[PDB]
């Protein structure tokens, strides 16, 4: 998984002044001559990646980063020409875009990502890498690429679920919940059995996290008050059954 991402002569001069015409602003223009560079390009994909690392944008990619937008064109580049991904990018180079785009937590980038490269239809070889973001206590990490990669029913409810929901990371935790019937039960379940056990929640918190090795959490949301708050929601939205 190393790519050859050192550029030559010939091109490195060019991209030099793009960023620097890139600089007046991020439009049809800009666009235009993106296209153009795929187009003379052998493999514009494994280019789109040699591009996306040269330029000082790609530790922080937002709509207007440069970096962005040369995945941006990319994507459209693919889809105006009507490209597929035969004998062109292979699961090595897959990984490639993967490390690149899973470290920022930007998910759009992401996104776009998955749909240039067609993580879908081989999104069975990125689990060992977010296990590994899971066993690194990334929650909303690992959680946002399962999302993502429409992961639905590879993961538990402890593996980032649980974890989110004590890092006060609703969001991400019930997207992924949303997505997943077979964890909303037991989810419930178990935030139930802090309550309907007459011992004190946060010893029941308390053991759920070390047990599982749960690091960053939000001790200040877990009370009877605002967990409570969070069972009556997540039964009434997935309409769970009177199991208090």
Known sequence: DF????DENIANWFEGFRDSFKTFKKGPLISQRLQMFYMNTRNPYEW?????ANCPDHNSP???SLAYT???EMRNFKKHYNLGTDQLVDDNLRMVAFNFVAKQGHCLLFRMVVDIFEFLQCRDLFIPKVREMIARKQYKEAGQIAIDLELFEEFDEH???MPLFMQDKISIAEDYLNKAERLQGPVVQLLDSFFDKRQSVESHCSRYITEHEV???YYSKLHQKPLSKLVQRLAKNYNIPRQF
């Open 215 to 217: 690091t960053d959490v």
């Open 62 to 64: 937002k709509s207007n």
């Open 70 to 72: 040369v995945l941006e």
């Open 48 to 52: 789109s990646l040699k591009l996306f």
């Open 3 to 6: 790519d050859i991402e050192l």
């Open 159 to 161: 593996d980032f679920v």
